[PDB]
From Swiss-Prot:
Upper lineage: Eukaryota, Metazoa, Chordata, Craniata, Vertebrata
Tissue specificity note: Expressed ubiquitously. Highest levels observed in heart, brain and skeletal muscle. Expressed in normal colonic epithelia and colorectal cancer tissues.
Family under the similarity heading: Belongs to the protein kinase superfamily. STE Ser/Thr protein kinase family. STE20 subfamily.
Active site: D139
Residue ranges, compositional bias (Basic and acidic residues): 271-290
Record localization: Nucleus; Cytoplasm; Recycling endosome; Cytoplasm, Cytoskeleton
Entire protein: shown range: 15 to 311 of 1360
Protein name per Swiss-Prot or TrEMBL: TRAF2 and NCK-interacting protein kinase
Primary role: Serine/threonine kinase that acts as an essential activator of the Wnt signaling pathway. Recruited to promoters of Wnt target genes and required to activate their expression. May act by phosphorylating TCF4/TCF7L2. Appears to act upstream of the JUN N-terminal pathway. May play a role in the response to environmental stress. Part of a signaling complex composed of NEDD4, RAP2A and TNIK which regulates neuronal dendrite extension and arborization during development. More generally, it may play a role in cytoskeletal rearrangements and regulate cell spreading.
Gene behind the chain: TNIK
Modified how: Autophosphorylated. Autophosphorylation is activated by RAP2A and induces association to the cytoskeletal fraction.
Superkingdom of source: Eukaryota
Ranges of residues in domain Protein kinase: 11-272
Naturally occurring in which organism (per UniProt): Homo sapiens (Human)
Subunit structure comment from the entry: Interacts (via the CNH domain) with RAP2A (GTP-bound form preferentially); the interaction is direct and required for the activation of TNIK by RAP2A. Interacts with NEDD4; recruits RAP2A to NEDD4. Interacts with TRAF2 and NCK. Interacts with TCF7L2/TCF4 and CTNNB1; the interaction is direct. Interacts with TANC1.
Cystine crosslinks: none
Disease / disorder: Intellectual developmental disorder, autosomal recessive 54: A disorder characterized by significantly below average general intellectual functioning associated with impairments in adaptive behavior and manifested during the developmental period. MRT54 patients manifest intellectual disability, delayed speech and hyperactivity.
Length: 294
């Protein structure tokens, strides 16, 4: 009745999967059934609790896409004084862990170009769906792209974190995946930026799969937040990668967002479109995960 429930006895958090930019992602478990879940935990000022519910309800329809972890439910853990209340967003679980978990458990901390392409297209499919319906994600990073046991790619969250930063002016995490225009906050309003920011973030995530870590990872967060808007756009360091991959990165990571290609432009990029059959690579990725140790 306008309120979100306390998760106590419904869901319990089991293990941190990732510490994203606009919240933390846990593997959670239904107390009664034992069914696993992905739970994105986000601090909320609590002044707007009903607003959250409204946004979630508006947005949840967009989670049913094959490349977005499907909304199960939402809970507000009211916490004592000194502690902010927390929104728990509960989504379908993905067993193979994160793209980040995959990168690290891979020898060399580097994915084969084919895998990057597959995963990049899956992320971009989800993003396409959201941007299509005017939803920004704004928290694309390897830790926020979960892989199922069958090597399906699913994005964590579907615009909820992005609506909180709007409703409740956020006061974050590592900035390495954040686009120049998001850091400069030149036009905060809705800050759609014609849905370009996610594309930049996809770029960084691609480099993350290639190089083991986002550019600027070795630097203090504040230095990077300083440098991202000021420095030229990152590129892949190695020349071992195809001209397609390097072009993709060149497209994703255009500094001026107005000159950055749009989602559906990027969808038709050779690196994405001109790539092996989907199921084809999915298999190679799947069995690899199986051998990896978590």
């Amino acid at each position: 009745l306008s309120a979100l429930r306390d998760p106590a006895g419904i869901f319990e958090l089991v293990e941190l999967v990732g510490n994203g930019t606009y919240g933390q992602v846990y593997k959670g478990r239904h107390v009664k059934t034992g069914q696993l879940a992905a739970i994105k935990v986000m601090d909320v000022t609590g002044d707007e609790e009903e607003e959250i519910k409204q946004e979630i309800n508006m947005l949840k329809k967009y989670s049913h896409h094959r490349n977005i972890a499907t909304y199960y439910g939402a809970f507000i853990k009211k916490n004592p004084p000194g502690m902010d209340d927390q929104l728990w967003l509960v989504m379908e679980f993905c067993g193979a862990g994160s793209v980040t978990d995959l990168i690290k458990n891979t020898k060399g901390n580097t994915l084969k170009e084919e895998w990057i392409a597959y995963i990049c297209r899956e992320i971009l499919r989800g993003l396409s769906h959201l941007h299509q319906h005017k939803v920004i994600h704004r928290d694309i990073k390897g830790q926020n792209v979960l892989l199922t046991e069958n090597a399906e790619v699913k994005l964590v969250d579907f615009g909820v974190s992005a609506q909180l930063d709007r409703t409740v002016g956020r006061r974050i995490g590592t900035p390495y995946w954040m686009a120049p225009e998001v850091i400069a906050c030149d036009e905060n309003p809705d800050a759609t930026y014609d849905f370009k920011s996610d594309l930049w973030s996809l770029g960084i995530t691609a480099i993350e799969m290639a190089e083991g870590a986002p550019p600027l990872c070795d630097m203090h967060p504040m230095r990077a937040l300083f440098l991202i808007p000021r420095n030229p756009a990152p590129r892949l360091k190695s020349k071992k990668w195809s001209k397609k991959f390097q072009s993709f990165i060149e497209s994703c990571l255009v500094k001026n967002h107005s000159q950055r290609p749009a989602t559906e432009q990027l969808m038709k990029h050779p690196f994405i479109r001109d790539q092996p059959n989907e199921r084809q690579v999915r298999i190679q990725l799947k069995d690899h995960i199986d051998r990896t140790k978590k």
